[PDB]
């Protein structure tokens, strides 16, 4: 809005360059592809100008799996195969020591760790190991999965609001901003 207006012009979420003043001007298509990723992130993650989102979740049931894993940033969710309910989370929680982990007690095993991480974002690293697919939730269902070392994979359904929640933050892993906008 201070050096490329008149040619770049915001229309909703993207800013497709459309006038007669773009003649004699050819945009690098790396640039227009990168900055439409970095504006669709800003409608899920940072909608209030600072960091923070909100999303709810719900676990499932499987063979030999009867337990509970997620403790992420000091708001535990505990299941011993009772009725399933929806619990409210918050990703950048107010603590002095952020992190996430898992816990699983089999019929052959007691509590075994699965993940252990001292990061400021801790929820997003073990989503990279997860395998996400569609689900019939309420508006955008998300059935997740995780595989242990002894089989017996888990089930976790996910509700989010208007966007789709913190699963978009996995788009950053190959991201290099381009260097030239013109030819």
């Amino acid at each position: 809005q201070n050096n490329l207006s008149g040619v770049l012009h915001r229309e909703g979420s993207r800013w497709v360059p459309d006038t007669i003043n773009t003649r004699g001007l050819t945009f690098n298509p790396a640039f227009l592809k990168a900055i439409n990723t970095l504006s669709e992130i800003a409608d899920v993650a940072f909608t209030t100008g600072n960091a923070g989102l909100h999303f709810e979740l719900r676990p499932g049931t499987a063979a030999g799996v009867m337990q509970t894993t997620l403790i992420t940033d000091n708001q535990k969710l505990i299941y011993v195969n009772q009725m399933p309910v929806w619990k409210r989370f918050t990703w950048p929680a107010d603590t002095e020591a952020p992190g996430a982990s898992l816990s699983w007690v089999s019929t052959q095993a007691g509590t075994r760790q699965y993940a252990d991480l001292p990061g400021s974002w801790g929820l997003i690293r073990l989503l990279e190991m997860a395998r996400r697919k569609a689900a019939p939730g309420v508006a955008s269902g998300w059935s997740l999965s995780w595989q242990a070392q002894d089989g017996r994979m888990l089930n976790y359904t996910l509700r989010t609001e208007a966007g789709e929640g913190p699963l978009v933050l996995l788009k950053l892993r190959n991201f290099v901003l381009p260097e030239t906008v013109f030819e």
Binding site: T61, V80, Q82
Partner: protein, 130 residues
């Protein structure tokens, strides 16, 4: 009367089956009650997650047994004298709150002092045996 609470909890393979028919484990709680009226008034939700301290105050002690699908766990409990009713409740995936097959009340008289009474779990119901 009865000095020591003895219970034997049997279980088949098909207990607490999900929508995929998968055999799941279950958690059963044992309650020592002074009143059985509040134990018949609570639903599935306010008993396992609720703060009905009128019911919890009538609970003298609580103990949670934890059985595999297709197994058994013996209960050797020092029975309190004010425990007029032994409350047995379970947490299935599909607890039929209407037909009330998820809880039983065992009074003072139906206990045996040196023999465990047999509680059999099958499907998502609780069943006594003579």
């Amino acid at each position: 009367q009865i000095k020591t609470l003895h219970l034997d909890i049997r279980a088949r393979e098909a207990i607490n089956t999900s929508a995929a028919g998968i055999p799941l484990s279950v958690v059963v709680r044992i309650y020592q009650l002074k009143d059985n009226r509040s134990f018949d008034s609570a639903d599935y939700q306010a008993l396992f997650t609720g703060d009905n301290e009128i019911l919890a105050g009538d609970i003298i002690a609580q103990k949670d047994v934890w059985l595999q699908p297709g197994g058994s766990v013996a209960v050797d409990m020092p029975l309190d004298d004010a425990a007029k009713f032994t409350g047995v409740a379970a947490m299935f995936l599909e607890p039929d709150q209407k037909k009330n097959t998820w809880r039983v009340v065992l009074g003072r008289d139906e206990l045996e002092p040196d023999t465990p009474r047999l509680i059999e779990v099958s499907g998502n119901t609780l069943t006594l045996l003579p």
